[PDB]
Structure 1
């Protein structure tokens, strides 16, 4: 594996000082890129995806457009439940979909044993190695998965949902089954993440995109302890394996009420959405974790000149050290790539102007 040239992102992640502020975006490989759609057209979403050459291509597309400071591997968080033996359908251009969600506790019998899963996800490991090779040391490469609770919500709710009602019903009516599912998810995630790193990933992101739906009490019973194991166990297995640990990032969408513990869940970076004021967050987390975020993605709909200023403002709030710039959620499919360019330039231009 090629030696990394730009490593600003990794050093920012670990807390080390840097000459400028690194930047990347969730869903940087996404439908807002025309070239993305002309390469999605190649096949049905989940074998594309299953083709190493195709993921690599997508992963690289934005990097050809913009001096981003990391690449994140192109995948869907649904691969994991799918590897567990849950059938996905691509319903009338409306996206991810389990036609037969888990509803009663017996349903759990349907699932694969968690340890074999890693072997079902060999195409991903392959795509990572492919991609780590072709970036050829330009920037580091982030692997990723969705956090146990999040996946649980997709498996139980089937599609997406405004309230997570079916899923929370499980939490309140079937605590044990819930604990059982969550454990299965954790034990699946660990070997998948270790895998990614063994396969060449240099940083790992965990997405808890459905944090918001839980409150403090639920979140500590059913989200936290699992968010914590993943970090714990992944760090261990890497050690036993003689491999260097990679920086880990928890991103709890709408998890303002959780920042305190996330800072001590043993992740190196904590992702923020745009609804947490940056200073409030620094406060909540203290000074030995790095923060990432948190421009409102919609902000990109503004002029490039307006974009610059909002960015300037964001930087002032987070300050020089311990900070990786990013949006508050992934890019939207109707965003203009020229405005993403603007966003990227503004971070760089202004983080330097901030120091010098």
Structure 2
């Protein structure tokens, strides 16, 4: 692999001082880009995921528009449950869908042994290697996967939900089966994430998107242990393979209640949603971890000038140490690319000015 030229994102991730704050955006490869819609219209959702060249292209697109300090591989969190044997039908503009969700304990028999998942996800590894080569060391490449609890919500709910009532019903009524499902997911995720690093990912993000549906007690029993397991095991496996460990990010959307624990869970970086004040997030996490976030993505509907001001305030609150700028959630498909660029430019410009 080519020698990484700009490693600001990695340095910030490990806690080191940098000359400016690095920035990237969740869903930077997303429908808000016309060219994204265009190269997606040639296939269908999970078919695009299967073409290394197509995934590489989607990954690169935002980097041609904006001087982002990292690329994130284009994929979907749902590729893991799919690799586990669940059928997906992402259909006429409706998004994530399992037409046959898991509903009882017996449904667990449908799933592949987690030890074979990595071999099912070979196309992802190929896309990562290809992208790492094509980026030619411009900026680091992030790999990613959904956290076990979050993947479980999708597998049980069948898609998105406002309450996770079915998934939480499993936790309360089927605690043993739930732990089994969560361990299967963990055991699939670890080789998948190691594989992404072996293929060339330089950092990893674990996306616990459905954290906030759980209170502290449920989260500590059913989400946290597996989050800790993933980092511990990925790190162990990488060491033993003779490879360097990469910075790992845990993002728990709506996980204000778990920030303290999440700073102790084995991740270099804790990603935040926009509902936590940066100064309060810093109190919760301490001085030991890097923070990532947390601009309300809807803030990008504001004027370019307003975005600039909202960024200035955000950076003032986080301070220059142990910080990666990002949004608090993925970019929405109706957002203006010019406003995305305004956000990237304001982070770079203000963070330098703040250092002066």
Measured against the shorter chain, the TM-score band is over 0.9
Q: CA deviation at 1:47?
A: 1.1
Unmatched segments (≥5 aa) in structure 1: none
Deviations along 1:314-352, one digit per CA (max 9) or x if unpaired, are 000000110000000000000000000000000000000
Measure the CA separation in 2 of the matches of 1:200 and 1:179: 31
Deviations along 1:203-233, one digit per CA (max 9) or x if unpaired, are 0000000000000000000000000000000
Residue 206 of structure 1 corresponds to which residue in structure 2? 206
Q: CA deviation at 1:44?
A: 1.1
Q: CA deviation at 1:52?
A: 0.2
Q: CA deviation at 1:54?
A: 0.1
SS of the residue 1:212 aligns to: helix
Measure the CA separation in 2 of the matches of 1:4 and 1:137: 4
Deviations along 1:221-251, one digit per CA (max 9) or x if unpaired, are 0000000000000000000000000000000
Measure the CA separation in 1 of the matches of 2:324 and 2:292: 5
Q: More deviation in 88-97 or 217-226?
A: 88-97
Residue 278 of structure 1 corresponds to which residue in structure 2? 278
Measure the CA separation in 1 of the matches of 2:42 and 2:66: 24
Measure the CA separation in 1 of the matches of 2:76 and 2:272: 21
> Which stretches of structure 1, 4 residues or more, deviate above 3 A after TM superposition?
none
Measure the CA separation in 2 of the matches of 1:57 and 1:297: 24
SS of the residue 2:206 aligns to: strand
SS of the residue 1:77 aligns to: coil
Q: Aligned pair 1:83/2:83, yes or no?
A: yes
Q: CA deviation at 1:93?
A: 1.2
Deviations along 1:108-129, one digit per CA (max 9) or x if unpaired, are 0000000011000000000000
Deviations along 1:38-85, one digit per CA (max 9) or x if unpaired, are 000110111110000000000000000000000000000000000000
Q: CA deviation at 1:274?
A: 0.3
Deviations along 1:278-315, one digit per CA (max 9) or x if unpaired, are 00000000001000000000000000000000000000
Q: CA deviation at 1:159?
A: 1.5
Q: Aligned pair 1:330/2:322, yes or no?
A: no
Q: CA deviation at 1:92?
A: 2.5
Report the TM-score when normalising by structure 2: 1.00
Deviations along 1:254-292, one digit per CA (max 9) or x if unpaired, are 000000000000100000000000000000000010000
Unmatched segments (≥5 aa) in structure 2: none
Deviations along 1:117-154, one digit per CA (max 9) or x if unpaired, are 10000000000000000000000000000000000000
Measure the CA separation in 1 of the matches of 2:53 and 2:261: 39
Residue 24 of structure 2 corresponds to which residue in structure 1? 24
Q: Aligned pair 1:111/2:100, yes or no?
A: no
Aligned residues: 356
Measure the CA separation in 2 of the matches of 1:286 and 1:92: 45
Measure the CA separation in 2 of the matches of 1:160 and 1:15: 35
Q: CA deviation at 1:91?
A: 2.5
Q: CA deviation at 1:199?
A: 0.3
